[PDB]
Structure formats: C-alpha cells, structure tokens
Amino acid sequence: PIGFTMYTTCIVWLAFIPIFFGTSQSADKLYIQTTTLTVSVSLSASVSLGMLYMPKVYIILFH
Amino acid sequence: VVGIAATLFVVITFVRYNDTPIVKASGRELSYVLLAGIFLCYATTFLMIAEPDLGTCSLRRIFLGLGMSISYAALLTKTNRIYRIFEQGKRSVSAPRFISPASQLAITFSLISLQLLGICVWFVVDPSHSVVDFQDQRTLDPRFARGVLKCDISDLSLICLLGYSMLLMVTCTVYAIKTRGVPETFNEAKPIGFTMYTTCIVWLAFIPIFFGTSQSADKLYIQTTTLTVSVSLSASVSLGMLYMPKVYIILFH
Amino acid sequence: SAEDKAAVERSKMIDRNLREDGEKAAKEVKLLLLGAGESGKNTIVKQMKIIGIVETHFTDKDLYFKMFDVGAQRSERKKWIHCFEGVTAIIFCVALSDYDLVLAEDEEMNRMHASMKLFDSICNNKWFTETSIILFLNKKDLFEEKIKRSPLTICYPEYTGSNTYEEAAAYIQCQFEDLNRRKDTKEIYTHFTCSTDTKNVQFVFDAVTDVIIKNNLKECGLY
Amino acid sequence: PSGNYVACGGLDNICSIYNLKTREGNVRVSRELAGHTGYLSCCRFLDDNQIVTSSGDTTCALWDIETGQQTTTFTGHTGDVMSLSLAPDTRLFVSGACDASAKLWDVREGMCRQTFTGHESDINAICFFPNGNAFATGSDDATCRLFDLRADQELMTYSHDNIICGITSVSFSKSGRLLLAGYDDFNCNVWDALKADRAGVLAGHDNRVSCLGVTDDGMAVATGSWDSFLKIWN
C-alpha cells in the first residue's frame, strides 16, 4: 500500500507540471494557480489516508 | 500514431495468441470492444485535426462521446460481472442473469443507445451551427491579423464528459470496492481502481487549466488541444494498465 | 366457455408454482455420494447431522441443499448414470481397508482393484465431463495404524517409497490423475476428513464454493 | 386406462401410487408400495387394481394396492430388466432384460413361456403388436426385429450400415403397420413392415430422445427427449 500510494502521489505531481506550464498570458493566473495548489495539497493529504487507512477501517469493521 | 501502433500490436497478439487461459479469462468480445473504444478515442484527434466543417463537429463529438461511453461501459460491466459472479455462486448454483457474452454486448449496446439518445436530445435543444469566426476574443487594435478555426462544441462536450466521467468513476469504483471479496487470478480490482483514480485526477487537473484557457484572450486553440491531449493520455494509461499483465504473461509464456 | 377461461388462470397459477419450485431448487447444490462396499457410508452422514438411495439435508452459513447417497445398489453402470446426468459434484469415499484383505471368491482381484476400477469407470466417462469428482479420505487413524504395523510396498511393487504417514497420504493423490485422459475440462479435488473432530466440515464445505463457480463459469464460456 | 390411478418410478424403491379424483384434495396417497431391492425402471397398469413394476434386480413382479404385497414373482433372466410391455387382451406381458433376449410372462401362472434371442447387444425398450401375434424389440446393436409367437422366430431384420448408435425406444402403429424407433442421433426413424425402408425421417430434437408414446387411434405420436420438449408429430 505504501508503494501504491507513493505511485499515485508521483502521478499527481507529474500532472502538476503541465498545468503550470500551459497556463500563460491570462489575467486569472494567480487565482487558478493558488486554487490548483490548494486542491493539490488537499488531495495529497487526503489520499495518504484514503489509500492507507481503508484496510485499517476494514479490519476494524471485521471485529 | 504510437497508440495506433500499440493497439494494432495488441489486437494482433490477441487474434494470434488466444489459446492461453490468461487472455481467455477476460471477455473476448469485451476486450475487443474496449480496444475498439480506445482506437476511437485515438482517432478522435485524427479526424478532428481537419477543418471545423460543422458536420465534422457533430461527427467528432458523437465519436468521442461514443468512445468514452463504450470504454467506461466495458470496464463497468467487467467489474460488475467479476463482483456478481461471487454472489451468484454463493447464493445460487447456476443463475445466468445477463452474463453471456451476447448479453454483455446487448447491455453495452443499450448503454451506447442511452448515450446516443442523450446526445440526440442535446442536438435537438442545441442545433450546434457552424461557428468558425470568433471576433469576440480577437482584438483588432494591435493588428493581430489572425483567424480562429476552432469549432464551437467545446462547452457542452466538456460538461457532458465531466458528468459522465464523474458518474462512471463513481459506479465503477464502488463496484471495485465491492469485488475484492474473494481472491482469484482474474481480479481486476487494484489496477482498475488505480486507472480510475488516474483518470479522475487527470480530469481534476484538466478542469482548472481548461477554465483558465477559456478565460484567457486569444486562447481558443489551446483548450481544444489540451482536452485532446488529456483524453488521449487517459486512453493511453488505460490501455497500458489493461495490457501490462497481458504483455507480462506473454513475455513469461 | 367458463371452464376453458378458468383453465388459462389455472395454467398461469400452476406455471408460477412450477417456476417458484424450480427457482427454489436451482439454489441447492446437488451432491452425489458413492464409494466402495461399507467404505464409511454411515460415518460421514452422522457428522453434520448434529450441527435404494438416501436423501439428506443440512444447511451451513445460509446455504441449504440436498445430498443423494447411492446406498446399496447392485446394478450396472450403463443404465444407472443416465438418471444421474448433470450432477455438479460427485463425492467418492475411497476405502483405506481394502488393500489388506485377501482376494474375494467372486471378484477376480481384491476390493482395492474393484475400487480403482469403479473410480476409472466413474471418471473416464463420455456422458459427464464438465462435472467434477471430489475425493474424501475417511478412516485415517486406522489406516495409519495398519500401515505402521504392516508395510504398503509389499502389494504395490510399482514404486519404492518409504513407509510413513505423510508420504502415504500424499502419494495417493498423484496416482489418480494418470488414468484420466481429458484434463482441460476435468479436475479432481482431494481433501482430508478427520473422524475425531466435527470442525472439519467447514474445512471442506468452502471447498464446494470452489467447484460450483466452475460450472457457473461453464455458463460464461470464456474458459 | 380408466384415468383413476397414477404411479411414478424412483431409484429409492418407493413406488408411490396416486389418484386424481379425490374429495377435499387434489392428489393424495393411500397405500405405500415397498419391498424392492433393485431400482425401478418402468411401471405398467394391467387394470385398475393389479399393477406390474420393473425393478433392477430381475423382479418384474405384479403388485396390488389393496394387499400392498406382490402376488406372483417372475424370474429367469440372468440380468436385470429395464423395460416392460403389456398386451391389449390383458392376459400376458413380455419382458426383456439386458441379456439380449425377451421372454413372455403369463399373469395367471407366472412363468416364462417362450424365450427369443438374436440381439447382438442389450435392449432398452420393448413394444407389443396390437393384434397380439408378434412383438418388436429394439437394441443398441442398430438392428430391429419382430419375434413371432407362433413361428418362434423373427420374420425380417432391420439392419443399418450408416448407423453406429442404438435404439432407445420402439413402438408400433394403431394396428402395427408402421414402426417407430428413436435413435441416439437426436431424432427418430420410421420403418416399414416388410420393406425395411426409412419412410419417415424425424428431426428437431435438441437432446437425446428417451421414450415416445403412440395413441390407440394412431393419429399423432408424441416423443419425449432430455431437452424438456414434448413435441407431438402428426
């Protein structure tokens, strides 16, 4: 599970380069930039538990 | 063209190497229709790179919608059958309920007919006329001397793709959390879930740059090509995560 | 007429009842038990009962089903298997006390040769091939006792193996697939069924969940 | 024959007798037939009181519902019998076991009167002539023959070169002019009386045919296969 969630985080951060390289010459640059940074850090903090604590919750729900 | 080469190679390997049980574990017609959907998602850009040609706009929108819907429906019915077979064997002896390959093709065609009805309702409410010249975003003050040649079917296609992707990535992930109750060799739960998460994160990272490009001036050419790139890379990663065990066992033999 | 009109409703009701009965019988796995002469025919059914064919029933983890014991029947196999065409699981209870007894007066060989001949005839059959035959090993304690007192290679000159409990219990499995010709559509399951504890039933009951899916996938056609 | 009683077979030696016309009830049981060691194959109703059963231990004895016990016992076949056949005059019945031979049995005295042999393999079902002069018999040797009671021998033989399978059931016509025999090729063949020609060819069966029934009038013939398809041919 650690390797799986790390691979997902690596794919997420690899998808963060084109979104910042393509956006250019726009008056709405900083707004969408901070928005995508905030949602990126939020999803990175969320998948650290959604892909590691799901089996924890499952084995808790067993007994 | 790399995706076309890869899909041709995997189709040749499927039609030539089919006696092994690993390729027979997955649905033959199912894998064929999934490869057809990926090939359609690839040829979307091939048939879109030409002039707008509003009839071609309708053709391209219908083609991309059908490809996306047929790929998602193939994956959904695959995971649903894998999840349902366990309950059918635990609670019944032989309960064929739309399990036969003919019934799978029938339900896939039913989903495609639903998608066609949806896009037909969309065409009925929106005629989608030929809009090639866009003077609202082109500024004549600095003497740009350039003309846009992008079609005007971007917003509706974008919102419909977003909605369908959300619904399918919800239902398929629920089916994938459902299926991993019994272990088997044809357990497509972790790779399918990873592909669904990758597609979801690709869409979630594509929507902000798409909105920023739509808000930018003289950026009507960038949104369409970045949407094409996003769809093509999603289809490519799906084909890769689908064919990785296939090529692995082929190399192992 | 009135009678001809009510006949339609009567037919609808009786067809609904027949469909309900068929749906109720379609969720009950049919087990077909057989074996040699007095090869633990009564000691196996007296296990799950607390927790001329014979009809038995026992429900485990919300799974009710019927089971048919062949009982005592002295007839041929050409006309007896026609009634049992389509059974999903055939449980053979091989005997472990037939290789030591002397040759019978009527049989050309001992009881173990008759047992393997019956197994070959019930396995290498052209009528049922998609079905499956499971093997139950009963009376293991007395078998180990008699194999530690008397050797086993004295009657089987084909191999030169040792005389232990694990090797003897492991060699009897591979000697059953050599007689089968069709292996791509036939399989044989073998499990250990102790006679001292009752908690072994759930050790093989889930094994049924392994084979049933097979014939369920028989409806898929992807194999 | 009167449509009052009905009885089914079974491998557990339980020949439960049932009736149709019952007061305050659809179908009920009154007497229980038991005492057989071999599996029951077929059952025929001689009359409304005396019935005959075919067991798998060479006991094709006659039974009664009132006394619940057998009256006479028929024995003399080296193998078990799996088929029966009654006569229209209700005086005797022919029985043939897997010994490739058929024997006639009387209801009064209860013993074999004549033995007929000539089949290369075991038989499956036997049928009697409506007049009562002979009787046909089908076997797995892809051959058919009708043994005569007076001549003590068969008249003609129905050979087959392109047929490798056998016959699972045989029947006559209304008067015995046309022959019907179901084969293992998921069909049936209609044979002549003396010409031995396949006049009628059957088809349409998805599974193997088990037994066919011909009415007394000889108008239509119903066939029964394993695919749960009771098709009537006319």
Three-state SS string over B159-219 comes to HHHHHHHHHHHHHHHHHHHHHCCCCCCCCCCHHHHHHHHHHHHHHHHHHHHHHHHHHCCCC
Euclidean distance between CA atoms C26 and C63, whole angstroms: 12
Q: Which of C80, C73, C70 is nearest to C44 (CA)?
A: C70
Q: Are strands D134-139 and D230-233 parallel, antiparallel or unpaired?
A: unpaired
Domains annotated on chain D, with CATH:
1-233 (2.130.10.10)
Count of residues making up chain C: 223
Q: Is B32 helix (H, G, I), strand (E, B) or coil?
A: helix
Q: Are strands C89-94 and C132-137 parallel, antiparallel or unpaired?
A: parallel
Euclidean distance between CA atoms B164 and B66, whole angstroms: 11
With 0-12 / 13-18 / 19 or more C-beta atoms within 10 angstroms meaning exposed / middle / buried, residue C179 is: exposed
Q: Which of B97, B95, D14, D16 is nearest to C25 (CA)?
A: B95
Min Cα–Cα distance to chain C from B201, Å:
34
Q: Which of B241, B187, B230 is nearest to B205 (CA)?
A: B230
Beta-bridged to residue D53, according to DSSP, are D43
The answer to whether C180 and C188 are in contact (CB under 8 A) is: yes
Q: Which of A61, C69, A50, C48 is nearest to B173 (CA)?
A: A50
Euclidean distance between CA atoms D116 and D146, whole angstroms: 10
Q: Is D23 left (phi over 0), alpha (psi -120 to 50) or beta?
A: beta
Euclidean distance between CA atoms D78 and D122, whole angstroms: 12
Euclidean distance between CA atoms D63 and D35, whole angstroms: 11
Dig out the tokens for B82 from the structure. 């894998």
Contact D80 C80 (CB under 8 A): no
Contact A22 B202 (CB under 8 A): no
Contact C75 D56 (CB under 8 A): yes
Element (H, E) at D145: strand D144-148
Contact C52 D12 (CB under 8 A): yes
Q: Which residues of A touch B209 (CB under 8 A)?
A: 18-19, 22-23, 32, 36
**Tokens 């087990």 belong to which residue?**
C31
With 0-12 / 13-18 / 19 or more C-beta atoms within 10 angstroms meaning exposed / middle / buried, residue D194 is: exposed
Q: CB distance from B186 to chain C under 8 Å?
A: no
Contact B99 C222 (CB under 8 A): no
The answer to whether D111 and D129 are in contact (CB under 8 A) is: no
Q: CB distance from C221 to chain B under 8 Å?
A: yes
Q: Which of C217, C212, C215, C221 is nearest to B101 (CA)?
A: C221
Report the amino acid identity of residue C120: D
Report the amino acid identity of residue C104: A
With 0-12 / 13-18 / 19 or more C-beta atoms within 10 angstroms meaning exposed / middle / buried, residue D60 is: buried
Q: At what angle do helices B54-91 and B101-125 cross, to 10 degrees?
A: 140
Euclidean distance between CA atoms B153 and B174, whole angstroms: 32
Euclidean distance between CA atoms B216 and B235, whole angstroms: 28
First-to-last C-alpha distance (Å) of chain D? 23
Euclidean distance between CA atoms C182 and C188, whole angstroms: 12
Euclidean distance between CA atoms A1 and B143, whole angstroms: 57
Dig out the tokens for B100 from the structure. 């036969």
Q: CB distance from C60 to chain B under 8 Å?
A: no
The answer to whether D142 and D149 are in contact (CB under 8 A) is: no
Euclidean distance between CA atoms A55 and B11, whole angstroms: 37
Euclidean distance between CA atoms B3 and C76, whole angstroms: 63
Q: Is C63 left (phi over 0), alpha (psi -120 to 50) or beta?
A: beta
Q: Is B99 helix (H, G, I), strand (E, B) or coil?
A: coil
Euclidean distance between CA atoms B225 and B222, whole angstroms: 5
Dig out the tokens for C103 from the structure. 């040759």
Min Cα–Cα distance to chain B from C144, Å:
35
Q: Which of D141, D88, D136 is nearest to D116 (CA)?
A: D136
Q: What angle do CA C185, C191, C195 make, to 5 degrees?
A: 150
Q: Are strands D32-33 and D15-19 parallel, antiparallel or unpaired?
A: antiparallel
First-to-last C-alpha distance (Å) of chain C? 54
Dig out the tokens for B199 from the structure. 């597609």
Cβ contact D–C (≥3 pairs, < 8 Å): yes
Q: Which residue of C has its CA nearest to D124?
A: C79
Euclidean distance between CA atoms A14 and B143, whole angstroms: 38
Question: Could you tell me the CA-to-CA distances from D175 to B51, C117, D134, D189 in Å, in that order?
Answer: 85, 47, 12, 18
> Among positive and negative, which fits the CA dihedral C106, C109, C112, C117?
negative
Q: Is B157 helix (H, G, I), strand (E, B) or coil?
A: helix
Contact B96 C28 (CB under 8 A): no
Contact B211 A32 (CB under 8 A): yes
Euclidean distance between CA atoms B136 and B130, whole angstroms: 16
Contact B28 C222 (CB under 8 A): yes
Q: Which of D199, D176, D224, D194 is nearest to D233 (CA)?
A: D224
Contact A23 B212 (CB under 8 A): yes
Euclidean distance between CA atoms D48 and C203, whole angstroms: 54
The residues, ordered by sequence, that sit 6+ positions from B138 with a Cβ below 8 Å of its Cβ are B144, B146, B147, B148, B218
Euclidean distance between CA atoms B191 and A7, whole angstroms: 12
Euclidean distance between CA atoms C204 and C91, whole angstroms: 11
Euclidean distance between CA atoms B241 and B73, whole angstroms: 17
Q: Which residue of C has its CA nearest to D80?
A: C75
Element (H, E) at D109: none
Euclidean distance between CA atoms D27 and D20, whole angstroms: 6
Contact C213 B89 (CB under 8 A): yes
The answer to whether B3 and B67 are in contact (CB under 8 A) is: no
Euclidean distance between CA atoms B165 and B71, whole angstroms: 11
Q: Which residues of B touch A40 (CB under 8 A)?
A: 205
Question: Could you tell me the CA-to-CA distances from D117 to B41, B219, D96, D166 in Å, in that order?
Answer: 76, 99, 10, 17
Question: Could you tell me the CA-to-CA distances from C97 to C137, C151, C176 in Å, in that order?
Answer: 12, 13, 18
Min Cα–Cα distance to chain C from B84, Å:
11
Min Cα–Cα distance to chain C from B92, Å:
4
Contact B94 C26 (CB under 8 A): yes
Element (H, E) at B146: none
Euclidean distance between CA atoms D127 and D170, whole angstroms: 6
How remote is the C-alpha of B3 from its chain's centroid? 14
Q: At what angle do helices A2-14 and B190-215 cross, to 10 degrees?
A: 20
Q: CB distance from C52 to chain D under 8 Å?
A: yes
Which DSSP symbol is given to D146?
E
User: Could you say which residues from 67 to 86 on chain C have a Cβ atom under 8 Å away from some Cβ of chain D?
Assistant: 71-76, 78-80, 83, 85
User: Could you say which residues from 119 to 178 on chain C have a Cβ atom under 8 Å away from some Cβ of chain B?
Assistant: none
The residues, ordered by sequence, that sit 6+ positions from B240 with a Cβ below 8 Å of its Cβ are none
Q: Which residue of C has its CA nearest to D58?
A: C75
The residues, ordered by sequence, that sit 6+ positions from C56 with a Cβ below 8 Å of its Cβ are C45, C49, C66, C67, C69
Euclidean distance between CA atoms A39 and D109, whole angstroms: 100
The answer to whether B201 and A15 are in contact (CB under 8 A) is: yes
With 0-12 / 13-18 / 19 or more C-beta atoms within 10 angstroms meaning exposed / middle / buried, residue A30 is: exposed
Euclidean distance between CA atoms B136 and C24, whole angstroms: 69
**Which residues does a gap of C–N over 2.5 Å follow in chain A?**
none
Q: At what angle do helices B190-215 and B54-91 cross, to 10 degrees?
A: 150
The residues, ordered by sequence, that sit 6+ positions from C212 with a Cβ below 8 Å of its Cβ are B89, B93, C29, C88, C89
Euclidean distance between CA atoms D40 and B109, whole angstroms: 52
Contact B21 C215 (CB under 8 A): no
Euclidean distance between CA atoms D148 and D146, whole angstroms: 6
Contact A8 B194 (CB under 8 A): yes
Output Rg (C-alpha) for chain B, integer angstroms. Answer: 21
**Sheet strands side by side (includes D134-139):** D123-128, D134-139, D144-148, D154-158
Q: Given a contact as 3+ CB pairs under 8 Å, which chains touch A?
A: B
Question: Could you tell me the CA-to-CA distances from C6 to A29, C10, C205, D22 in Å, in that order?
Answer: 79, 6, 47, 20
Q: At what angle do helices B54-91 and C201-218 cross, to 10 degrees?
A: 140
Count of residues making up chain A: 63
Q: Is B86 helix (H, G, I), strand (E, B) or coil?
A: helix
Euclidean distance between CA atoms B132 and B54, whole angstroms: 9
Count of residues making up chain D: 234
Contact A29 B209 (CB under 8 A): no
Dig out the tokens for D22 from the structure. 């019952």
- Which residue from D12, D13, D82 is facing C79, i.e. has the nearest CB? D82
The answer to whether B54 and B128 are in contact (CB under 8 A) is: yes
Euclidean distance between CA atoms C184 and C180, whole angstroms: 11
Neighbours of C26 (CB within 10 A): 11
Q: CB distance from C184 to chain D under 8 Å?
A: no
Min Cα–Cα distance to chain B from A40, Å:
9
Neighbours of A12 (CB within 10 A): 19
- The 3-state secondary structure of chain C reads CHHHHHHHHHHHHHHHHHHHHHHHHCCCCCEEEEECCCCCCCCCCCCCCCCCCEEEECCCCCCCCEEEECCCCCCCCCCCCCCCCCCCEEEEEECCCCCCCCCCCCCCCCHHHHHHHHHHHHHCCCCCCCCEEEEEECCHHHHHHHHHHCCCCCCCCCCCCCCCCHHHHHHHHHCCCCCCCCCCCCCEEEEECCCCCCCCHHHHHHHHHHHHHHHHHHCCCCC
Report the amino acid identity of residue C192: F
Q: CB distance from D226 to chain C under 8 Å?
A: yes
Q: What angle do CA A32, A36, A38 make, to 5 degrees?
A: 115
Euclidean distance between CA atoms B228 and D114, whole angstroms: 91
